[PDB]
């Protein structure tokens, strides 16, 4: 991607998504309150 | 953390725990962008004021933490920002931790992503929420037992200057609500180095924008706190990582 896998190592292609989230589907208690402020 | 609350489990899987190695004692927050590289700021290395200037044999660093499964890794060496002058502003506030190996990733251990040209420009905006996690004190003047979290409103770079003598460069911005908010909030200390980050509502990624330099006092109203511009400095960033990853 943006980094080197061989310098960098595991992680970037899947960063900031989190396990018991994201990954499934589920959003955490105040993350709406930082969306709302996007709009 | 000020007037923050508590920590879900895994709701910040990169957070990671700077401490001094025994004589043991949390110094700082820091994040994880890897499984081998980690983000802190360069004053929680190298701060002669507060007596602080360690090597990778001071400092030791605990992940995947949740109360006080996780992991405790070495460090095998620590990057400082080369335009870092402590005897001066704290501009370019930010250093890299090399972990001797790496560590294995979990629910609870997975690295936050670093923005790009276009997340910034759309995000980091006056008004807009990041998120800030750390173990700072409960109390300006103590300690969380759990993870603290606190999201506040980007500021607008006039009014930042304003509320401050200090010289603020384009490498900071600052964070936190206004006197007349009802709000509060704040980093305090103990959630230096720590990461500042926005979730964005393109992708659903989470991406670290800042990390925590400084602040006058905790939540003190009239007063933000100050990060460093991660984006900025990105491409010294990758200088490290591809000259001693
Ligand atoms: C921070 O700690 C550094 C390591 O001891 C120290 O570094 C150096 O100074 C010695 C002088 O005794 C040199 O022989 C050595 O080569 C220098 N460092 C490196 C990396 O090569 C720093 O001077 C200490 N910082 C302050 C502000 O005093
Ligand atoms: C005062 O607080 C409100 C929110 O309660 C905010 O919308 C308003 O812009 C703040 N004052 C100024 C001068 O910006």
Known sequence: ?39 | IVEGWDAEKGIAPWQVMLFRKSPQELLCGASLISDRWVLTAAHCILYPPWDKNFTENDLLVRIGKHSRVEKISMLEKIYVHPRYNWRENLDRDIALLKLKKPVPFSDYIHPVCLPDKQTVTSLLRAGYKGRVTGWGNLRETIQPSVLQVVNLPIVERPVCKASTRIRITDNMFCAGFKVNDTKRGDACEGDSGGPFVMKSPFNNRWYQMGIVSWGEGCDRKGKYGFYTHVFRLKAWIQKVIDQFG
């Open chain 1, 1 to 39: 991607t943006f980094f080197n896998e061989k310098t960098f190592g595991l992680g970037e292609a899947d960063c900031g998504l989190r396990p018991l989230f994201e990954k499934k589907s589920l959003k955490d208690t105040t993350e709406k309150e930082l969306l709302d402020s996007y709009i």
